[PDB]
Structure of Isocitrate dehydrogenase [NADP]:
Amino acid sequence: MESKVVVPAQGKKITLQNGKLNVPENPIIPYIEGDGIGVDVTPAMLKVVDAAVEKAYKGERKISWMEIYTGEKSTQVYGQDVWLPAETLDLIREYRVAIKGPLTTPVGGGIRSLNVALRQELDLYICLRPVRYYQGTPSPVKHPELTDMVIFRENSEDIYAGIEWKADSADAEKVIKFLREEMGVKKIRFPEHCGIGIKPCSEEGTKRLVRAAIEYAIANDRDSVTLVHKGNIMKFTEGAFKDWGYQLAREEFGGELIDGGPWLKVKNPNTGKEIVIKDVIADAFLQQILLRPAEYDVIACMNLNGDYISDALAAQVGGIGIAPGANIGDECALFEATHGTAPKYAGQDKVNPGSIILSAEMMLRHMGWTEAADLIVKGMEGAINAKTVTYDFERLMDGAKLLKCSEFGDAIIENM
Amino acid sequence: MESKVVVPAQGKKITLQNGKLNVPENPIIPYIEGDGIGVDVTPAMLKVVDAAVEKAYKGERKISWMEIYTGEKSTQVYGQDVWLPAETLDLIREYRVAIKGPLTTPVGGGIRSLNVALRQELDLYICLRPVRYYQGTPSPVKHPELTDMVIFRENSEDIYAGIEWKADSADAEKVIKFLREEMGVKKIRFPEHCGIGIKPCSEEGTKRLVRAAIEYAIANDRDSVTLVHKGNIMKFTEGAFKDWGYQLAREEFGGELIDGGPWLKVKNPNTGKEIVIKDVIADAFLQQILLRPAEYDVIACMNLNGDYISDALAAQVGGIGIAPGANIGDECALFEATHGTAPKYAGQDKVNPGSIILSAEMMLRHMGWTEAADLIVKGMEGAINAKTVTYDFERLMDGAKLLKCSEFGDAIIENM
């Protein structure tokens, strides 16, 4: 089969020169509709983004959307077993900036996460999850407004590497024999009927992630960067991530000891502000985000902890369904809805398009189209304050006006 | 050196016959004071427990406390480098039931967690963390009273096995060569300057833990058992834990499919109640405990996830410093304060003795001395409701009367 992707006639490709995106006034942006509710949320995002772009630049700029495929729809387009076509990886890399709805992975075929596959195959090593509170959002906590954090989750290593062998398989036995006989491992409690997973953490992987977090703190004049890890138990992976993170702050950003340690102060070269570089053990950190959220800002952590932290924070601010996210690498970036596919409601024009819309806000900002991005934030803040919202919010409040998915997109536009 | 432990003259050893403890009226109970604030909280616990015992059984029963050592104090007693004496492991096993204050592990000597060492060496495979709300406790969430859960955290395997090699070490390189050359591993993003950790999960380890969780749900007529795991990424360890947990429910407890699955219903043989056996992915679970806490009850999970879940739950109910905990095995059990050593306040009679006191409540209950246990719960509930509390609580409320650590122990007794 030939490609089924149609490159927009009007429209120009974004280019990269010196780690800086050169964005034309008519950029072609690939988008993946997404499985399940992607069918509801993606069109709402397309309309909201076009309106923000149109309103901000008065018609001088316009995105040429180009549909590309991954997931169930990809099998419908490309046939049986084509869940993630090579052309999709090629196109995201070529066009530099893309966005996607939610995706789920089939079970029973030995296929691993399609979301993780996109991240790893494109080497999008930064999973960026900013978490703030939108006034008027129903929240399970007393002071959600105190939460304003940005999570830099390492996206290329950790136990997500997907290196593991099934209990009783010849391979697991082979690995366990090697560990026990050649490495002298004596700590496996039950070596029989035992599954084995491998957790890698490297200096290069850690430093490119932490480097991005510190550059982000500098560029946005944030107050601190917290390295979250479980290094007191996993000394050589989690503990190494922490050590390498502080080392990078010292070696590349002039970080110097605060008092007697272990925190460092990094001077913002643009504002002269002192950015604090500190660290917190992961289990205590899940308590601290609830008890002292105001003391945290930019967070840098490994893949698994980042997954947990991002989710816990989204829930606490009432944003489980409106949490934006990006996967960024040195050559391209893929923005994404961060919730699941919710098939029970798919096609009903019911769910909250807020997450994919705020991920589109991050995309526009990444493109340097900050005015259009600010209009989306403004629209989202006003629609939620107006209490004109989708069921997931409405059901938790009194005095709200219930809107369909598409209608909430319109409300966002109405509030720009 | 000879033992420095003094076996109580009056006092008899608890015995085990058929997996059932035979507790005399004068049981000898070993206790470890603990590092840091253990010096403040342990004496408060001893006094509170003695009072509950005295009040419940009118003098017919009395614990003969026997001090044993681990941590900084152990080095003071047994000399340089004796952080965890063999005799301590021997004594906890011999006397069957013991309690300890907090312990921290020295850094710089390549020593691994002393708390984990106690758990693994004594094969205390169940880390039991019940989490409920005490009326009047200052909490960061709007409805902490909806939380009433019991966590069964697997304590003998997972990445806590402590099997890992340092970046650039000959061993790490050896392991990575084996993986890449012999196992054909291609998923390690950066094989150089790479730390490696091993995560084991076995059928026997999983099932003894889940078996205990289900027996606990039956014995206490709880509503459900939720298997929490991250099996969609770690198929052979986390996913296997989930699969084995449902399998055990079917094989040993008659669990049968609910509707179209995947949940099972297990009939309580004593009350005829239908216990639901279900599962939730770990990242979503950290959101669900905040958004729908009332839907969860008994939780069964692996070592790392349990560590995180226990901490997150304790924080949400305002119980970061009063969370009880037990480590239970087939031959003995070790109850423990669950917070850290807080050396900055050690010796000031300032901190909350609530966690070690509620762990003593679990110990008394475990001993079958449920009346004395109920008196501690009653005392704790009344002292907190009276707003007569330690600084960690007082500072978060208005109208409280500030009490010292020792004074709060007295307030607990005053409210029995």
About this structure: Residues 38-57 of chain A form the longest helix (20 residues). The first strand of chain A starts at residue 15 and ends at 17. The radius of gyration of chain A is 22 Å.
